[PDB]
DNA sequence: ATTCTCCAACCGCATTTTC
DNA sequence: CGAAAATGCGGTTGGAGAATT
């Protein structure tokens, strides 16, 4: 269990970002071996897709996004990657979290 | 001081890929 | 060929930061 777990530091982010910029996405397992990063591919993949990627939206969910997600969820159930495909700039994990914290309350 | 909220990132598991 | 490694998914929760006593 040499791999670090938990919150990514800015130092770790920079190493992951520089690697992905230089060598592209994927082969996530190679990163720890090629860099000083103590992170498994699984953890790298997730950090890239949910935070570092230039395609992810940063703002709070809009009322229009909320309505879209409610309706997609009604159509599709708890199939978050399938739902996220029709929510521009939001990932499965974002949509799931929004549902569980904000919409599952109702 | 302590309790609460919320979400980033983990876990276990199934599917896909590698060699 | 097929065992191990890598990818991807959805449920779950540790703990930072916000709120309360
Ligand atoms: Mg999306």
Residue numbers in the entry: 14 to 119
Sentences from the paper on this structure:
R2R3-MYB proteins only exist in terrestrial plants, but they form the largest subfamily of MYB transcription factors. R2R3-MYB proteins play important roles in metabolism, cell fate determination, growth and development, and responses to biotic and abiotic stress. Previous in vitro and in vivo studies showed that WER specifically recognizes the cis-element WER Binding Site (WBS) located within the GL2 promoter and inhibits root hair formation in N-cells.
Though crystals were only obtained in the presence of WER 12–130 (named WER-R2R3) and dsDNA, they diffracted well (up to 2.15 Å). WER-R2R3 is composed of six α-helices, H1 (V23–H36), H2 (W41–K47), H3 (G54–L65), H4 (E76–L89), H5 (W93–R99) and H6 (D105–L116). Helices H1–H3 and H4–H6 belong to the R2 and R3 repeats, respectively. The WER–DNA complex structure showed that the third helices (H3 and H6) of R2 and R3 are inserted into the major groove of the DNA, producing a sequence-specific interaction with the 5′-AACCGC-3′ motif. A10:T13* (the first base pair of the 5′-AACCGC-3′ motif) forms two H-bonds with N110 of R3; one (2.9 Å) is between the N7 atom of A10 and the ND2 atom of N110 and the other (3.0 Å) is between the N6 atom of A10 and the OD1 atom of N110. The third base pair of the 5′-AACCGC-3′ motif, C12:G11*, is recognized by K109 of R3. The NZ atom of K109 forms H-bond interactions with both the O6 and the N7 atoms of G11*; the average distance is around 2.9 Å. G14:C9* and C15:G8* (the fifth and sixth base pairs of the 5′-AACCGC-3′ motif) are both recognized by K55 of R2. Owing to the presence of R52, R58, and R60, the outer surface of WER-R2R3 is highly positive, and the side chains of these positively charged residues form extensive H-bond interactions with DNA phosphate backbones.
